[PDB]
Design a protein around this ligand. Structure first.
Ligand code: HEC
Ligand code: HEM
Ligand code: HEM
Ligand SMILES: CCCCCCCCCCS[C@@H]1O[C@H](CO)[C@@H](O[C@H]2O[C@H](CO)[C@@H](O)[C@H](O)[C@H]2O)[C@H](O)[C@H]1O
Ligand SMILES: [Ca+2]
Ligand SMILES: [Fe+3]
Ligand SMILES: [O]
Lengths: 449, 142
């Protein structure tokens, strides 16, 4: 198909923004240990919102690109409107870069004045630091997007992949509305914040992720669409079974009932299952191939994505989802260790997987690059993937020691927040190295084009 | 074990748990007035939330352990700095001496806040510590 080349810009700008993300990571990573680094010009909290808002934004660009690519093929017909796909891109990309520059060029309390938050207060919540106007912009785009690729599935084949992907995307945009509801009651606020973050990342995004993985496994392994789509539905079912009540693992210590401690801890124990399925799903279909596929990197990406997501989301997720454990780790470097692997392994890698598949056949190079670009992608893969297992190790170390010094002792023996942070400094430097190796591996990956 | 069977486990079993969730929230949202102490939630506590929101304190700090891991937990900073009687006066001084500027130490910005703004902040943070947060944190330090 020929309208699939509107997915190309989405994929590039995603990778552009992905480089912005890692830099600001590296700054913050250093501010941990050189406390007044770039102060007062760029305070830690500004670097952090740029770091995390680039992540959330470059993953959407990455998800949209994938839909603009793979929905034509699945629907067996051209995209409803390539005009729209380009008009939205620039709006979204303008909207993104402005919002980021807002964080960077004006004091946040000022930006709240400038954009007039008083009328409709939604600013100042983790991941949702963007001005209300900017949120509105994101919804407009996300509506234009949904519509455009939504129509394409109607006027064409209705494969399971295409359907589930539409569910995930519709659901993504709906839940994002709760970013507008901003309760006066703090505990009410927190309750409904996790409808954005958790039902995204552990519910609705798992449909997006699963669907792309399954779409990729059909094309590189040549296995029967009918067993792939079966397996897909299993993984999804297991995701929404565990994950919807499993939300309760975020509802332990925020001022809601204690019955969530049982419900959250019981249902969260099940949330690594979908991820365990994902690796069996990758490994089997990739192992019973009717095909040796010319792009050897995709197979590595698909297998790695599923493993890394299992380790980050699943294993690291389980390790501290049990209220008894979570009590001592809640809001610790351990939480940061998990978040990093779970975000990277699941969603950063799956965007890179489908890019690794579609990019050559968006530049009309072929199904694969030459052997130069291929051993580079794979170098990048490993540098990044291995860089991040260290990042999570180093921070897991911090978190464990931190629980030890600050959290477990009783009043008086408990060492101070800012005092324990001084013990953790070595780990934080090691992490900056891991972070540098990561940037290298991202640059390796990037040179492969 | 066909593709029709797996597709229905997803369809039915999710509609079940959405309801169960929504039913579970409905209850929970009735217990909130009592667990959060909404009586004590004055327009000060509320204006204080907005100061908190407007200067992105959560981008360095945690509040009931949710936020950023750069600076201390603040859901319980009251009991650590002067308690309920002396906390406000503390925050007053604390907010206007930033940045401490001790070299190579993690910085906090000057937020140019009015004493009325800093007071609501304190009221917001006090009301927050008195939320039934199922005995979290372990200890005084956050
Ligand atoms: C609203 C915008 C904010 C409020 C209210 C508070 N902060 Fe901060 N903060 C930061 C650091 C690095 C420290 C430790 C200072 C040191 O020991 O050198 C603090 C400390 C506090 C405290 C004292 C807490 C305690 O138990 O000692 C309070 C009460 C407090 N902060 C309130 C850093 C930052 C920061 C980094 C860019 C931001 C944006 C804020 N703080 C914002 C707020
Ligand atoms: C790809 C999937 C996942 C992603 C991207 C992810 C991401 C995150 C992030 C970013 C946070 C902290 C956010 C904050 O407080 O600002 C978090 C918290 C947490 N996650 Fe996940 N997660 C995933 C899956 C899971 C799994 C499947 C489980 C359970 C097995 C798990 C267990 C937890 C727990 C217990 C916390 C609470 C830590 C705390 O107490 O703050 N996560 N997750
Ligand atoms: C590679 C170098 C990186 C560095 C040096 C870095 C550094 C940081 C720092 C310092 C924070 C804030 C910690 C705090 O809140 O106190 C953070 C947050 C975060 N980063 Fe990164 N980061 C890096 C890469 C990544 C990558 C590759 C991802 C990909 C998924 C990612 C996802 C996140 C997420 C989700 C948070 C919010 C975590 C939470 O609240 O638990 N980061 N990062
Ligand atoms: C598979 C396991 C599923 C279990 C689900 C139900 C879990 C409920 C258990 C209580 S959660 C939490 O546990 C805490 C003990 O670690 C309990 O802490 C107790 O001791 C603390 C010192 O160790 C002390 O600071 C507290 O004041 C004291 O109450 C805490 O109350 C409780 O909410
Ligand atoms: Ca956080
Ligand atoms: Fe979760
Ligand atoms: O999570």
């Amino acid at each position: 198909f020929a309208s699939q080349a509107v997915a190309k810009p989405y994929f590039v700008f995603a990778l552009i923004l992905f480089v912005g993300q890692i830099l600001f990571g590296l700054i913050m990573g250093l501010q941990y240990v050189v406390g007044d680094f770039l102060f007062p010009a760029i305070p830690f909290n500004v670097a952090r919102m740029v770091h995390t808002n680039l992540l959330i934004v470059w993953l959407l660009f990455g998800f949209m690109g994938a839909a603009y690519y793979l929905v034509p093929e699945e629907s067996d017909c051209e995209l409803y409107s390539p005009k729209l796909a380009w008009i939205l891109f620039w709006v979204f990309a303008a909207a993104g870069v402005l919002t980021i520059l807002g964080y960077l060029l004006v004091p946040y309390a000022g930006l709240a004045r400038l954009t007039g938050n008083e009328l409709w207060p939604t600013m100042g919540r983790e991941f949702l630091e963007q001005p209300t106007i900017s949120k509105a912009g994101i919804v407009i785009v996300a509506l234009g997007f949904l519509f455009n690729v939504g129509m394409t599935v109607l006027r064409g084949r209705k494969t399971a992949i295409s359907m589930v992907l539409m569910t995930g995307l519709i659901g993504l945009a709906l839940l994002f509305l709760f970013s507008f509801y901003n309760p006066e009651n703090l505990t009410r606020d927190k309750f409904y914040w996790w409808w954005v973050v958790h039902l995204w990342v552990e519910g609705v995004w798992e449909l997006i992720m699963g669907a792309i993985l399954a779409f990729v496994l059909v094309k590189i392994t040549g296995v029967d669409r009918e067993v792939i789509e079966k397996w897909l539905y299993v993984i999804i079912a297991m995701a929404l079974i565990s994950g919807i009540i499993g939300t309760g693992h975020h509802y332990f210590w925020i001022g809601v009932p204690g019955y969530w401690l049982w419900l959250g801890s019981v249902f969260s124990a099940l949330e690594p299952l979908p991820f365990f399925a994902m690796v069996l799903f990758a490994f089997n279909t990739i192992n019973r191939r009717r095909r040796d596929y010319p792009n050897r990197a995709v197979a590595l990406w698909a297998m790695g994505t599923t493993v890394m997501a299992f380790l980050g989301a699943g294993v690291w997720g389980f390790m501290h989802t049990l209220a008894p454990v979570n009590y001592y780790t809640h809001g610790t470097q351990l939480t940061a260790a998990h978040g990093h692997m779970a975000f990277y392994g699941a969603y950063a890698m799956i965007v890179m997987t489908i890019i690794s598949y579609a990019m050559p056949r968006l530049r009309g190079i072929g199904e694969a690059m030459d052997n130069r670009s291929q051993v580079l992608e794979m170098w990048g893969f490993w540098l990044m993937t291995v860089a991040m297992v260290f990042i999570t190790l180093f921070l897991s170390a911090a978190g464990v020691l931190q629980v030890w010094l600050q959290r477990m002792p009783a009043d008086g023996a408990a060492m101070t927040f800012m005092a324990t942070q001084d013990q953790l400094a070595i780990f934080y430097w090691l992490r900056e190295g891991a972070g540098v190796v990561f940037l290298i591996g991202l640059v390796a990956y990037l040179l492969s084009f | 074990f066909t593709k029709g069977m797996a597709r229905n486990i997803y369809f039915g079993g999710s509609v079940f748990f959405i309801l169960l969730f929504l039913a579970l929230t409905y209850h929970t949202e009735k217990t909130l007035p009592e667990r959060t102490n909404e009586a004590a939630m004055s327009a000060a506590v509320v204006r204080g939330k907005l100061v908190w929101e407007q200067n992105n304190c959560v981008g360095c700090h945690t509040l009931l352990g949710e936020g950023a891991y750069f600076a201390p937990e603040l859901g319980n900073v009251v009991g650590r700095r002067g308690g309920e009687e002396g906390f406000n006066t503390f925050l007053q001084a604390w907010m206007k001496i930033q940045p401490l500027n001790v070299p190579g130490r993690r910085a906090m910005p000057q937020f140019h806040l009015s004493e009325g703004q800093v007071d609501d902040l304190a009221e917001f943070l006090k009301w927050s510590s008195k939320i039934d947060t199922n005995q979290w944190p372990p200890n005084k330090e956050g």
